[PDB]
Write a protein that binds this ligand. Sequence first.
Ligand SMILES: [Mg+2]
Ligand SMILES: [Mg+2]
Ligand SMILES: [Mg+2]
Ligand SMILES: [Mg+2]
Ligand SMILES: [Mg+2]
Ligand SMILES: [Mg+2]
Ligand SMILES: [Mg+2]
Ligand SMILES: [Mg+2]
Ligand SMILES: [Mg+2]
Ligand SMILES: [Mg+2]
Ligand SMILES: [Mg+2]
Ligand SMILES: [Mg+2]
Ligand SMILES: [Mg+2]
Ligand SMILES: [Mg+2]
Ligand SMILES: [Mg+2]
Ligand SMILES: [Mg+2]
Ligand SMILES: [Mg+2]
Ligand SMILES: [Mg+2]
Ligand SMILES: [Mg+2]
Ligand SMILES: [Mg+2]
Ligand SMILES: [Mg+2]
Ligand SMILES: [Mg+2]
Ligand SMILES: [Mg+2]
Ligand SMILES: [Mg+2]
Ligand SMILES: [Mg+2]
Ligand SMILES: [Mg+2]
Ligand SMILES: [Mg+2]
Ligand SMILES: [Mg+2]
Ligand SMILES: [Mg+2]
Ligand SMILES: [Mg+2]
Ligand SMILES: [Mg+2]
Ligand SMILES: [Mg+2]
Ligand SMILES: [Mg+2]
Ligand SMILES: [Mg+2]
Ligand SMILES: [Mg+2]
Ligand SMILES: [Mg+2]
Ligand SMILES: [Mg+2]
Ligand SMILES: [Mg+2]
Ligand SMILES: [Mg+2]
Ligand SMILES: [Mg+2]
Ligand SMILES: [Mg+2]
Ligand SMILES: [Mg+2]
Ligand SMILES: [Mg+2]
Ligand SMILES: [Mg+2]
Ligand SMILES: [Mg+2]
Ligand SMILES: [Mg+2]
Ligand SMILES: [Mg+2]
Ligand SMILES: [Mg+2]
Ligand SMILES: [Mg+2]
Ligand SMILES: [Mg+2]
Ligand SMILES: [Mg+2]
Ligand SMILES: [Mg+2]
Ligand SMILES: [Mg+2]
Ligand SMILES: [Mg+2]
Ligand SMILES: [Mg+2]
Ligand SMILES: [Mg+2]
Ligand SMILES: [Mg+2]
Ligand SMILES: [Mg+2]
Ligand SMILES: [Mg+2]
Ligand SMILES: [Mg+2]
Ligand SMILES: [Mg+2]
Length: 183
Amino acid sequence: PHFHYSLTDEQAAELVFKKYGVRITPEQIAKAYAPEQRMSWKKSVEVARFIKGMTLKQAKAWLEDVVKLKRPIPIKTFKKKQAHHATPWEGWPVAKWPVKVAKRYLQLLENLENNAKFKGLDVERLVIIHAAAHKGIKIPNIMPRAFGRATPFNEETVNVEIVAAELPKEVVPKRYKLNLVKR
RNA sequence: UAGGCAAAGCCGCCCGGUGGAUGGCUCGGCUCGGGCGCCGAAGAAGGGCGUGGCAAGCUGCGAUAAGCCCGGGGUAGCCGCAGGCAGGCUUAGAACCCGGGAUCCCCGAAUGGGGCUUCCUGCCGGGGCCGAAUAGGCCCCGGCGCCCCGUAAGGGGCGGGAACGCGGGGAAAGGAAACAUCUUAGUACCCGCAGGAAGGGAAGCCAACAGGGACCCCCUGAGUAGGGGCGACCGAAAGGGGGAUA
RNA sequence: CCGUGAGGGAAAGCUGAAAAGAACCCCGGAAGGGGGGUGAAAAGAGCCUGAAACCGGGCGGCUACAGUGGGGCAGGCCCGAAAGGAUGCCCCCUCCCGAAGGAAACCCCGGUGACGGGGGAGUACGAGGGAGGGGGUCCAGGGUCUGCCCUUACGUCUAGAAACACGGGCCGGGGAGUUCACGGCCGUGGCGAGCCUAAGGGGUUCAACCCCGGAGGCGUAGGGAAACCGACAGCCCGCAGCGGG
RNA sequence: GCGGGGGCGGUGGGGUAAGCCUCCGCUCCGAGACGGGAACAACCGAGACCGGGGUUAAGGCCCCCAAGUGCGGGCUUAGUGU
RNA sequence: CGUGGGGUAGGGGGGCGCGGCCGUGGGGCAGAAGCCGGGCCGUGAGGUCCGGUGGACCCGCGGCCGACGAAGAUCCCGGCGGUAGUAGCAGCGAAGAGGGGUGAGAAGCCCCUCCGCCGGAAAGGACCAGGGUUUCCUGGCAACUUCAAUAGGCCAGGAGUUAG
RNA sequence: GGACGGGGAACGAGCCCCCGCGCCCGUACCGAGAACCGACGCAGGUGCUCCUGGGUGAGAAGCCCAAGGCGGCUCGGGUGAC
RNA sequence: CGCAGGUCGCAGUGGCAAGGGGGACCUGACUGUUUAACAAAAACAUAGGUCCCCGCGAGCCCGUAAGGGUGUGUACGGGGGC
RNA sequence: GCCCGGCGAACCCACCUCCAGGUGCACAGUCCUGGGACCCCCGACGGGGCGAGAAGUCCCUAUGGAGCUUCACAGCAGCCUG
RNA sequence: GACGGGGUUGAUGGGGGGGCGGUGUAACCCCCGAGGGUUUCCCGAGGGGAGAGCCGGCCCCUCCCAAUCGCCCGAGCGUGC
Ligand SMILES: [Mg+2]
Ligand SMILES: [Mg+2]
Ligand SMILES: [Mg+2]
Ligand SMILES: [Mg+2]
Ligand SMILES: [Mg+2]
Ligand SMILES: [Mg+2]
Ligand SMILES: [Mg+2]
Ligand SMILES: [Mg+2]
Ligand SMILES: [Mg+2]
Ligand SMILES: [Mg+2]
Ligand SMILES: [Mg+2]
Ligand SMILES: [Mg+2]
Ligand SMILES: [Mg+2]
Ligand SMILES: [Mg+2]
Ligand SMILES: [Mg+2]
Ligand SMILES: [Mg+2]
Ligand SMILES: [Mg+2]
Ligand SMILES: [Mg+2]
Ligand SMILES: [Mg+2]
Ligand SMILES: [Mg+2]
Ligand SMILES: [Mg+2]
Ligand SMILES: [Mg+2]
Ligand SMILES: [Mg+2]
Ligand SMILES: [Mg+2]
Ligand SMILES: [Mg+2]
Ligand SMILES: [Mg+2]
Ligand SMILES: [Mg+2]
Ligand SMILES: [Mg+2]
Ligand SMILES: [Mg+2]
Ligand SMILES: [Mg+2]
Ligand SMILES: [Mg+2]
Ligand SMILES: [Mg+2]
Ligand SMILES: [Mg+2]
Ligand SMILES: [Mg+2]
Ligand SMILES: [Mg+2]
Ligand SMILES: [Mg+2]
Ligand SMILES: [Mg+2]
Ligand SMILES: [Mg+2]
Ligand SMILES: [Mg+2]
Ligand SMILES: [Mg+2]
Ligand SMILES: [Mg+2]
Ligand SMILES: [Mg+2]
Ligand SMILES: [Mg+2]
Ligand SMILES: [Mg+2]
Ligand SMILES: [Mg+2]
Ligand SMILES: [Mg+2]
Ligand SMILES: [Mg+2]
Ligand SMILES: [Mg+2]
Ligand SMILES: [Mg+2]
Ligand SMILES: [Mg+2]
Ligand SMILES: [Mg+2]
Ligand SMILES: [Mg+2]
Ligand SMILES: [Mg+2]
Ligand SMILES: [Mg+2]
Ligand SMILES: [Mg+2]
Ligand SMILES: [Mg+2]
Ligand SMILES: [Mg+2]
Ligand SMILES: [Mg+2]
Ligand SMILES: [Mg+2]
Ligand SMILES: [Mg+2]
Ligand SMILES: [Mg+2]
């Protein structure tokens, strides 16, 4: 089947003007979708909340270090009974290293970078404007328990959509903005 | 002081994901009315196994296996559900429908005898094969159930069918505001036996001194007579009107 | 499919008019993504519409010195196209009328006094109802937050429920005074000392409808176990109504 | 509907007593909003169609909280009491 | 006109909605039902209109009839949450490591070397019942295996059981 | 299998050589800490039902090692608080 | 299987394997059986003792009946109690 | 156990609750009067939430059962007798 | 999580040297060894001398190795009383 995105290209361009002050066309927008990923859904949402606003090269750099267990991902929402760590950012002590989620996101970023190149956009000025993770369909399964009863043991898939826009280079950020309180 | 100025979190709207409500639809159900009504030793119903070029299920069919023959209708397509890939059939008249035939594995009333595996196995008679042989062995085909009728020849019964029909055996729960007689109920259910219906049917009748005139079924008589811890409750018949009429 | 067995037993419908069932290009190990196509419309085979619960993002309001929900009033920020008003709404000013109610200053009388009385004065004012002038621009309505005032989840039994009384995680769909027979009664309709046909029969445009069918049932007379017997306009009071004063 | 209950009164009668048991009467709650009582079915005031204005009831008038740090006389030293 | 205006159980009187039927009048591909938000009307049950979505039916009025109205029954069926990225994937006397190869991808698949466990056996040889193709070969990884996988009793295709 | 009897033929063996026939059904694999039953790839049960080398040893005990098998009682790494 | 000599350790059945012992009371003689899934006992059974119904067409028991068990038995026996 | 990587449930759930003293269906998170608290996250425990599980088996009631007893009310076999 | 110290102008961890310490005297070599036989140059439990050997989650010294490369946060302005 076909999946839709949470915002249109027209809605994307308006958000690009609001957040950066420049006007762009739908030509300057490239998309990518990753439907029904077999990975953790609570951590997929956190990765989407982090890479939003980075350039496509910066997000690939950070996600590569997550797979090498060298840089963490902040956990702001699904944080119950989660440990505190020393972090490279400022303003949040809950971090993780989701390696399976970071690898699927790297494939999505690779597909996104190809679609920008195919359209003729410049990858160096491609800034991720919209990213969101959605719970997909369940692949149901049960676990046998004690006393003859069985309980659900499900594989909840994840749907990932990403939208980037090619901005003028004088407004693209040149370093990571890692102030999670202000972010 | 307040704003730029934001954590986690809360509320509302919009978009998306999940979900399958709602609405529309309907080759399905349900109810009612009319019809029609038995099949089986000429081996049934039911079941198993098998059968399609690619086919697992359903449907059909049975080693002649989604089929074979004949006739009537039907003329141009067809090879089921079932929208694919091939190859065919068909104008020498197919597919399709209707009537008549053929085939119809194993188990099955199953009926030569067994059957702890729907499979196995015996005797007689005929045929065939291995074999030097007419020996011996192996295989195919036919007959071989019980109880009966008949001089014999020969013939009958057996099992099945949604409900209905006839004979016999026969509760309890519940009700009675407890409960035993009682009711429930001659019911549920069981055993046996028929038909397309069955059973009933042709005055040792009913009546009341006036007369009806076999039987069954419908309306009524009637919850009347009567039965009954005369309680709960149960409960006609004659007579009259009809269907039909022998 | 479940049970050794006697037996028990589900879930599960929808592409489009036509596959026209998505060519071709980039990426991906692949599911698949992007671009590009078909189609009136993706309606895309996980296929009509596609709600809520739920989850993600965007937007609006709040957010780390203040105890939460619901209502009223006031304000901040945001929306306020249509379907509502804009002949509106608010401010000021001016005029008039004005219910119940109703001052003050100041003068006079009294009390130690808090205060009372005469006048001022039924006055200024007063819910609301009319008219006009100028100014402004949205007003009504909605979301969210703040301030002040008010405020003890729901359903249930109970004398008594916010109860430490019991039931519900949430949302969608489903979910409970029916029918017959008999009896009482009511509201109407037909006929009326009579009323109605039942079964059934004929016809029909065929379960409808028209016509026939009075058997029977109830009423017209009661008393008595039964045999048996079997009934009023005479008088008075008097509502309505009528006639007389 | 045939489970009642609260207050007051009959030293009701019983009981050590009981928010206790069982009678008699008015009223209220149940089935009655609202103001006061610090909260509080039945104690005091009072009986609610909706909106507004006014005046009072119970009770209150130093602050919380509308209205008096109101007036005269006397008592209390215990923060008794409010 | 009323020194009329509380009200549970209960009695009485009127109205709204849902599905169909008998009539009557209409709308709809220039967009019906349904769905999301909003305005207006009505004390109210509700009605009606606007914008979006949708794609073929539907509605006003009179009469009649019902399988006719839900917030609840430790209600039934389905879906989906917080709990929560939490519990568990310890215990029952074995366990892995290095190098190479395959592969998109390798701690885990194949090979060698080292290390360990059983050895009258949770473990080697045989085999009954039961199971019924799980056996062998090839290929694969959408699902299954408490993690992974290129592995597999899994999936797809083909093959296999010989008696005096 | 042997003996003991009766009957029959003119042939004839349990010895040697040579010739022919032997149908039907089962036969794969697990046989269990993953192929059976227990809803499961379940620490139970069925079946340890039968069999198995060396050293020590009373020993079919335990411990070590053969033949033979296994690292699949199907998560991995770090830390070294309570 | 024994004897002699020498010699080391904290420890010589050095690991593995592998009884703590004694006195007395209650109670059931003993071995045995038992509430699968909260009771293993002093409960049940037991050998031994004794009593009763019975000479077989018996006694006791089963079956609607046909008939059956005890009984292919016989008082040193069958059945029934304690 | 804790931390990291991977898989990934359930119980329970009207909403969801800082403390003191009162009041109230007499044992309040929600009412009254007070005392406090910057918010968020982690680990642990088991005082509270009359914590969760289970329509209390204890007690009573019902003109409710079942099983057992007999000197209950009745009845039926069986045996004896005419 | 945090906290503390160092981070090349450096002794922060390791290597090497030294100190202190634990155990108990390694290998080799020499002597003895109950008794036996290849009579005595052999076997033999074991004992003595010299040498200890092994080891340190401690201290000192010494830049031989590594404390690198890098990645982020961060006030700045207006308003009124
Ligand atoms: Mg997952
Ligand atoms: Mg089990
Ligand atoms: Mg925030
Ligand atoms: Mg058949
Ligand atoms: Mg036969
Ligand atoms: Mg009944
Ligand atoms: Mg009764
Ligand atoms: Mg009874
Ligand atoms: Mg018959
Ligand atoms: Mg007949
Ligand atoms: Mg007849
Ligand atoms: Mg009767
Ligand atoms: Mg759809
Ligand atoms: Mg507007
Ligand atoms: Mg308008
Ligand atoms: Mg109660
Ligand atoms: Mg009570
Ligand atoms: Mg209540
Ligand atoms: Mg209850
Ligand atoms: Mg509950
Ligand atoms: Mg009473
Ligand atoms: Mg009283
Ligand atoms: Mg009451
Ligand atoms: Mg009060
Ligand atoms: Mg005041
Ligand atoms: Mg005091
Ligand atoms: Mg009223
Ligand atoms: Mg109508
Ligand atoms: Mg209700
Ligand atoms: Mg449910
Ligand atoms: Mg969940
Ligand atoms: Mg754990
Ligand atoms: Mg671990
Ligand atoms: Mg071991
Ligand atoms: Mg070993
Ligand atoms: Mg052993
Ligand atoms: Mg074995
Ligand atoms: Mg293979
Ligand atoms: Mg295999
Ligand atoms: Mg398979
Ligand atoms: Mg074999
Ligand atoms: Mg397992
Ligand atoms: Mg070996
Ligand atoms: Mg392992
Ligand atoms: Mg030991
Ligand atoms: Mg004993
Ligand atoms: Mg014993
Ligand atoms: Mg037990
Ligand atoms: Mg025990
Ligand atoms: Mg005993
Ligand atoms: Mg004795
Ligand atoms: Mg005695
Ligand atoms: Mg974890
Ligand atoms: Mg109290
Ligand atoms: Mg509470
Ligand atoms: Mg408790
Ligand atoms: Mg109870
Ligand atoms: Mg109970
Ligand atoms: Mg009891
Ligand atoms: Mg009673
Ligand atoms: Mg019983």
